[PDB]
UniProtKB/Swiss-Prot annotation:
Organism: Homo sapiens
Interval of the full protein contained in this chain: 1892 to 2261 of 3546
Function: Ubiquitin hydrolase that can remove conjugated ubiquitin from AXIN1 and AXIN2, thereby acting as a regulator of Wnt signaling pathway. Acts as an activator of the Wnt signaling pathway downstream of the beta-catenin destruction complex by deubiquitinating and stabilizing AXIN1 and AXIN2, leading to promote nuclear accumulation of AXIN1 and AXIN2 and positively regulate beta-catenin (CTNBB1)-mediated transcription. Recognizes and hydrolyzes the peptide bond at the C-terminal Gly of ubiquitin. Involved in the processing of poly-ubiquitin precursors as well as that of ubiquitinated proteins.
Record's protein name: Ubiquitin carboxyl-terminal hydrolase 34
Tissue/organ expression: Expressed in brain at low level.
Similarity comment: Belongs to the peptidase C19 family.
USP domain location: 3-322
Active site residues per record: 12 (nucleophile), 254 (proton acceptor)
Length: 340
């Protein structure tokens, strides 16, 4: 049905990343049909990702052992350590950027599928000059602390701040100190929008990072129009297709994934979801997304109620752009079909 990925030690973050990539048809097919070139920058990683995807699609087993892929993977220091819990957002961004660097073809596919452009504007209120700079992204960081839902988070990402009094902007054109309005807006949005729902605050008394477990909701249907460049200064509506959940603390936490099957049509109409948790994959009742992903308090019996905040909650949200109008053909190379 669906194949898991064996945890090699502390590789929760890898399994969540590869499975969500695998379940995005456009990404699965671009990996299978990738064009190799003799002097390409991540050649072995490509082959091992092709094999992983091939194994996930065609293996009769229950789990792939991603050890060959890890042993070819380099992030900052040369090897990828099997027993260190990497940040999932960082790994997702690292992999996607590797794929982008493989070839011009893949860079174009990746920038369209996962990439977007933020514009940072500053509008002077005391001269005619404007400044605007572009910022590319693959994920959008969304503050969860003191926010009730992802719209309030995006209101904060997109907040118009005015530089005044002591914080006066210096216009580079006329060299004057000026009041100005500074604002971030989305100029281009990817087909697959990824949000890192960030629950960590720096307690600068402990000098440590602490997880926020308050309630934070997000909808199945999201309208990005009010955050777009046109609105502030192709469809903008999205459907939720996956949630990477983090449970525990920053230190000793773990990741697992609720993912929608958008590959299988006569099952996509039935809104079938699955829980991908290392080597174990099983169907998920998506009516339970709020319970499993929104955080906030729950109660249990101790006889009296005992109340605590859930330590499991959304870590990354995956949204797919709505398209007005398939059964997918994946072209695994003949040689890989031989291997599997
Ligand atoms: Zn000026």
């Amino acid at each position: 049905r669906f194949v898991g990925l064996t945890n090699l030690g502390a590789t929760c973050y890898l399994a969540s990343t590869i499975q969500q990539l695998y379940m995005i048809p456009e990404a699965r097919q671009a990996v299978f049909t990738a064009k190799y070139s003799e002097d390409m920058k991540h050649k072995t990683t490509l082959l091992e990702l092709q094999k992983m995807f091939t194994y996930l699609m065609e293996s009769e087993c229950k789990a792939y052992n991603p050890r060959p892929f890890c042993k070819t993977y380099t992030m900052d220091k040369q090897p990828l350590n099997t027993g260190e819990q990497k940040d999932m957002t960082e790994f997702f961004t690292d992999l996607i950027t590797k794929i982008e660097e493989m070839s011009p073809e893949l860079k174009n596919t990746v920038k369209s599928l996962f990439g977007g452009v933020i514009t940072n504007n500053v509008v002077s209120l005391d001269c005619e000059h404007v400044s605007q700079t572009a910022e590319e992204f693959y994920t959008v960081r969304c503050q969860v602390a003191d926010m009730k839902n992802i719209y309030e988070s995006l209101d904060e990402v997109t907040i118009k701040d005015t530089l005044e009094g002591d914080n006066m902007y210096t216009c580079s054109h006329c060299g004057k100190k000026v009041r100005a309005e500074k604002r971030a807006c989305f100029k281009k949005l990817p087909r697959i929008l990824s949000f890192n729902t960030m629950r960590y605050t720096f307690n600068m008394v402990t000098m440590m990072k602490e997880k926020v477990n308050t309630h934070f909701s997000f909808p199945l249907r999201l309208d990005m129009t009010p955050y777009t460049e046109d609105f502030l200064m192709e469809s903008y509506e999205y459907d939720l297709i996956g949630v990477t959940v983090h449970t525990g603390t920053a230190d000793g936490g773990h990741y697992y994934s609720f993912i929608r099957d958008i590959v299988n049509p006569h099952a996509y109409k039935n809104n079938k979801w699955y829980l991908f948790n290392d080597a174990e994959v099983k169907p998920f009742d998506s009516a339970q997304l709020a319970s499993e992903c929104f955080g906030g308090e729950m109660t249990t019996k101790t006889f009296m109620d005992f109340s605590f905040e859930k330590t499991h909650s959304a870590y990354m949200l995956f949204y797919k752009r709505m398209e007005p109008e398939r059964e997918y053909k994946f072209d695994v190379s003949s040689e890989l079909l031989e291997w599997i």
